[PDB]
C-alpha cells in the first residue's frame, strides 16, 4: 500500500510549575510533524508557527469569543484536570525491585560484569551507584539508561565491569523518591 | 517543568483513522475507543478515581478530520514522509527459567501511526495473552508504541517481535532468547 498519507495532530498541553501555582497552556496544531499554528497562554492569541498557519491565526484571532475560551483554559481546563488526576499521577510512587546478577562482556570463562537490575519503579528519576568494599566504583559503569515499560513503570540496568575476587563485597545502592533511605543490595564472590 | 498533561489527538487519511488520548509526563492515562465510544483507562485503578465522557472525544476527531481536509489542500496535497521505527525487545524483569515474565516490544520514532506487529515463538505467530498500547505521541511529533507477550522462560524457545511499517523496506525482526 503506497497511497499517500496525510496526518493532522493536535496537542492541548498544560504545563504545571509548583503544582497549580504557575500554569501555562499550549494549544498546538500539526500537519504531519509540522506545527503550523499555536495558542500560548503567555501570549493570549494564536500565532502562526509557519506560513501554513497564517490563515488560522488571522481567522481565529478575529473571533474574540474563541480567544476568551482559550484564555480561560489555564483555569477551566488545566487547573481543573490537575485536580482530577493529581492523586494517582503527581503523587504516584512505586518503589523499585532491585536484583544483582553476574554476566559476561563477551563469551569468557569468568563473570566480569555485575548487573544491578532496578525494576518496576515510578516516577522516572533514580540514582544508582556501585560500591566495592564501601568505596564508590565510578569507573567501568555503563547502563541502559532509563527505560519506559509503557505501563506507568520504569526500569534500568546499571552494570559494573569488574573481575570479582574472593573477599570483596559489591553493593548496588538505589535512591528514588519512593524510598525514605537508600535501597542497597549486596553481592559476594 | 514539574509536570505536563497533554490531550493528544490525530486523524489520518486515507485510512480515516483517529485517536484521542491523555498523557501525563509521557505515560498514557486513557484513550477513547472510537468505535465503541468508550473510555479505556491505561491502569484499571484510574477508572475508579475519575471518569471521562467518551462521546466528547468524537467531536474533536470530527473537527480534526475537517481541519485535515483544509490543511491537505492548503499544502497543495503534500503527503507525509514515512519515518521507519526503531524496535527494541526487552523483558519486564530479570529472566528466571520457569518464572513467569513479559516480553516487551518497544516501537519508537515512527510515522505515520500505522504498524503491523507480530510476536513469533520459534518462528510461528503467537496470539495468546498478547496486548498492546495505542500510538503514543512523542515530543518530536513522531509516535511510539508498546506490545507485550507474557511468557514462561525456557531454554527451548526463541522469540521475535516482527514489525512492518511503510518506511521499512523489509519487515524488522528483533530477537530474544534465554542467555
Amino acid at each position: 500500500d503506497t497511497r499517500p498519507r496525510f496526518l493532522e495532530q493536535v496537542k492541548h498541553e498544560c504545563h504545571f510549575f509548583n503544582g497549580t501555582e504557575r500554569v501555562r497552556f499550549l494549544d498546538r496544531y500539526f500537519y504531519h510533524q509540522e506545527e503550523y499554528v499555536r495558542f500560548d497562554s503567555d501570549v493570549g492569541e494564536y500565532r502562526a508557527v509557519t506560513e501554513l498557519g497564517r490563515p488560522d491565526a488571522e481567522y481565529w484571532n478575529s473571533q474574540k469569543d474563541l480567544l476568551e475560551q482559550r484564555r480561560a483554559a489555564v483555569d477551566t481546563y488545566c487547573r481543573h484536570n490537575y485536580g482530577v488526576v493529581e492523586s494517582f499521577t503527581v503523587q504516584r510512587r512505586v518503589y523499585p525491585e532491585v536484583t544483582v546478577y553476574p554476566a559476561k562482556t563477551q563469551p569468557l570463562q569468568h563473570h566480569n560484569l555485575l548487573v544491578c537490575s532496578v525494576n518496576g519503579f515510578y516516577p522516572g528519576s533514580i540514582e544508582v551507584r556501585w560500591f566495592r568494599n564501601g568505596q564508590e566504583e565510578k569507573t567501568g559503569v555503563v547502563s541502559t539508561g532509563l527505560i519506559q515499560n509503557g505501563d506507568w513503570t520504569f526500569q534500568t540496568l546499571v552494570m559494573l565491569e569488574t573481575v570479582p575476587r574472593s573477599g570483596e563485597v559489591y553493593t548496588c545502592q538505589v535512591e528514588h523518591p519512593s524510598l525514605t533511605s537508600p535501597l542497597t543490595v549486596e553481592w559476594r564472590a | 517543568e514539574e509536570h505536563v498533561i497533554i490531550q493528544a489527538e490525530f486523524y489520518l487519511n486515507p485510512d480515516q483513522s483517529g485517536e484521542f488520548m491523555f498523557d501525563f509526563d509521557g505515560d498514557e492515562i486513557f484513550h477513547v475507543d472510537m468505535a465503541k465510544k468508550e473510555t479505556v483507562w491505561r491502569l484499571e485503578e484510574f477508572g475508579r478515581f475519575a471518569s471521562f465522557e467518551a462521546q466528547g472525544a468524537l467531536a474533536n476527531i470530527a473537527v480534526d478530520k475537517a481541519n485535515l481536509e483544509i490543511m491537505t489542500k492548503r499544502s497543495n496535497y503534500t503527503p507525509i514522509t514515512n519515518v521507519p521505527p526503531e524496535v527494541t525487545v526487552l523483558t519486564n524483569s530479570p529472566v528466571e527459567l520457569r518464572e513467569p515474565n513479559v516480553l516487551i516490544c518497544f516501537i519508537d520514532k515512527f510515522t505515520p501511526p500505522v504498524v503491523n506487529v507480530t510476536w513469533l515463538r520459534n518462528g510461528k505467530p503467537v496470539t495468546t495473552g498478547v496486548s498492546e498500547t495505542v500510538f503514543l505521541p512523542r515530543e518530536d511529533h513522531l509516535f511510539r508504541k508498546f506490545h507485550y507477550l507474557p511468557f514462561l522462560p525456557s531454554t527451548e524457545d526463541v522469540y521475535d517481535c516482527r514489525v512492518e511499517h511503510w518506511g521499512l523496506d523489509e519487515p524488522l525482526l528483533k530477537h530474544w532468547e534465554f542467555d
Partner: peptide, 13 residues
C-alpha cells in the same frame, strides 16, 4: 473527578 476535554479549533473553509 470528571475529566474535561477541550475542543479543537475549527479552521474555515
Amino acid at each position: 473527578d470528571i475529566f474535561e476535554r477541550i475542543a479543537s479549533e475549527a479552521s474555515r473553509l
